[PDB]
Amino acid sequence: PLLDASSLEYLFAQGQYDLIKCLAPIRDPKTEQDGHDIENECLGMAVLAISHYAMMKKMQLPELPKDISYKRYIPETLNKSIRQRNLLTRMRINNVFKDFLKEFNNKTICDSSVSTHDLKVKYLATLETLTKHYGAEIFETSMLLISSENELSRCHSNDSGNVLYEVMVTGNLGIQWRQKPNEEWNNFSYFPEITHIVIKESVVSINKQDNKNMELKLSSREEALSFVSLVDGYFRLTADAHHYLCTDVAPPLIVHNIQNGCHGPICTEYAINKLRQEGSEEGMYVLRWSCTDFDNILMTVTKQFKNFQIEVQKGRYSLHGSMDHFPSLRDLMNHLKKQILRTDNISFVLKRCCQPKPREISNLLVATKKAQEWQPVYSMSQLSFDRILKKDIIQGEH
């Protein structure tokens, strides 16, 4: 699974606040039947929320009934709509909500034997499927230019009209755009296919591997910086974690890692396997951040496979158990190059480090259906070719 047990609680809180505060846009109905259906599903969502709170509060509903009211757990627009309705409908929906909660709290918990974690997945899935374009970023612009430079073409697409364009970005679709009606989106590319980014004042221009260019303008600089932050984060999450696109929004920690070559929180088996490939000779070592501690780097040296930890505090670098300290990580590690290391009965000297490789498969990467199609083909022992019949060619001058 992608996320851990710690992040799910905060993500549930984020979704809950997004639902209650009406910051996320709800889905508009298509008729009266589905319009009532959405309200009913929202009421059931509130039932689920209060049930979760009660279970995590560790008392059954009649023990603490004073502080229960669905008003706090429904979109404020829905609140305004329902307050403008008849009283009889109000008491009726109170009774319906009470009946649903009474049924769910008593019967469903035994029929399903679900826990606090179990309701989380359905809460998030339901909030996903009920909110229109949930988890999406859409940008509208007055100008958009797309060009292609095919042989003798230099095709300057688009026109100089006054129409307005919108741009939407999601990780599960890539980049798409369309005209705003007074229509189906069209695909442009995906994150690994993108080569680089260039920013001019308030103009954003992206380039593809097939030399395709798309350029657009924003009203300000910081918004374009946010946009390129989005695209760079998606590229890192899908294409490569050891690369940034724009130098203007490059995070300093990755800059330091690239300057030093240190890896991140990669699993132990990965790095152990990495040592096997090169030759497992005494002297090599790999550096990667501790998956548990933010201030500690761990190195694996190598048959034997010995691990060693280094504390990094206030930018100062020093080895554990050593009363001295060094200002730079490179200054630290260069210092120990010229000494002998004693380990129980065996001793050794480091000789060479290990550095990352392009698009190196690891736990940090995310497997998606669309990126699966971009996996390289396996042709380790395969040659294919097409023959040309001798009567189909004419030999000419040298």
Binding site: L3, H36, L43, G44, R92, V96, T108, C291, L336, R342
Partner: protein, 37 residues
């Protein structure tokens, strides 16, 4: 209208459950001692 229509919400049935990753097991040795040549 809705007085004559009663139906439980369709988002109350549960199936197949779910499971995240729990955590990672903390583990690390330290056995350094150093001498010069």
């Amino acid at each position: 209208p809705w007085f004559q229509g009663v139906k439980t919400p369709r988002a109350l049935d549960f199936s197949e459950y779910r499971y995240p990753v729990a955590t990672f097991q903390p583990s690390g040795p330290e056995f350094s001692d150093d001498l010069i040549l």
